[PDB]
Amino acid sequence: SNAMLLYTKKDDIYSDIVRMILLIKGANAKIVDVSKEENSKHLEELNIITPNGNIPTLSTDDFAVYRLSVIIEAIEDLYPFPPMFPVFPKQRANARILLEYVNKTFLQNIIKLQSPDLDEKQANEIKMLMQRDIISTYKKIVSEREVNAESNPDAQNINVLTLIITFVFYYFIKLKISIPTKDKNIIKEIKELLSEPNFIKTI
């Protein structure tokens, strides 16, 4: 039927994000942890349908798409409800830019830190490079969300870049990286932000 197959690996922040969007959509989808040796059968497959056993991969009968943006957009086509993006073509683009930043800065770096051959000095730099631009980042993500929410109070769409970041905090927490902030309610926001139901359900 709706044979949507999502290929994943445990603790792979991309997978975790696609898995929580699919949840929100209410899309039915056979998640597949390739880390698990039971699915040796699917992993054999994956390396047929993607140039480098790419993860995550969203496979259906018609296509096998990888790469976060493509995927996130792909899901928007497939399950329109509820909306993932703003509606005003200016704000849509801004988010597309921001998502591309949050990615080259935290998302892929988070993945470098998981490699077991990283040179002790390498990461300390990575982590701290991350600590620098995270608060400013969060602050940007909010501002934009205040805009798009207010430009249309009737639209009632979700802010994908808020979801995405909830994960960047959850991995900051997973990797024992500190979130440098005194600001009272930022931490209140953060805590509430990790306390949204579907996030828990994703973990």
Binding site: F63, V65, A74, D77, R92, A93
Partner: protein
């Protein structure tokens, strides 16, 4: 003035040729202006970072390479520059990325390393193989991987332009490709951009 938008562009730059090809496609009343033919003071006024294709209208200014084109297609919706069939559109959105990422770099590397003729001799031999084996793999379709004109075609149109201006030309010895390029340059979009 009423030039709803204006596109500032550099010469021999695909990213700008991509944008001009799609703005034409959108029958849009836009002013187009060049760089190099601007005051070193204003160039910094509009785009403070020397990125160069920059589209600006009344209350917005944009140049993010990987996002600009998607924006034109969304801002001025008709005619649509993506497929209608979900699945098709989904995989065009992927071929776009693969293009911007695995193919456009071959361009820079044909330029940045071009002041040397022994390297070129080999690179042109590669671009030869890489296409040789796909010129078969695609056929029986009017434009690229669709029925109608996609952003994907804008991407490729512009890319070819720059490469054949590096000396890399497509011959009778590729096939459905040469004529797909012939068709590409047949379009009033691609033609006002090539001259």
């Amino acid at each position: 003035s009423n030039a709803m938008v204006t596109l500032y562009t550099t010469k021999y730059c695909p990213y700008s040729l991509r944008a001009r090809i799609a703005l034409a496609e959108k029958k849009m009343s836009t002013d187009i202006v060049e760089a190099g033919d601007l005051e070193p003071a204003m160039i910094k006024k509009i785009t403070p970072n020397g990125v160069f294709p920059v589209l600006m209208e009344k209350d917005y200014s944009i140049n993010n390479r990987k996002a600009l084109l998607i924006y034109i297609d969304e801002r001025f919706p008709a005619p649509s520059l993506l497929p209608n069939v979900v699945n098709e559109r989904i995989k065009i959105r992927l071929s776009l990325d693969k293009i911007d990422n695995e193919w456009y770099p071959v361009l820079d590397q044909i330029r940045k390393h071009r002041s040397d003729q022994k390297m070129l001799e080999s690179m042109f031999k590669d671009l030869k193989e890489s296409l040789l084996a796909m010129e078969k793999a695609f056929t029986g379709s009017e434009f690229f991987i669709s029925s109608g004109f996609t952003l994907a075609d804008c991407y490729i149109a512009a890319l070819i332009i720059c490469l054949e201006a590096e000396g890399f030309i497509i011959d009778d010895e590729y096939g459905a490709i040469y004529e797909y390029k012939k068709r590409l340059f047949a379009r009033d979009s691609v033609k006002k951009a090539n001259i």
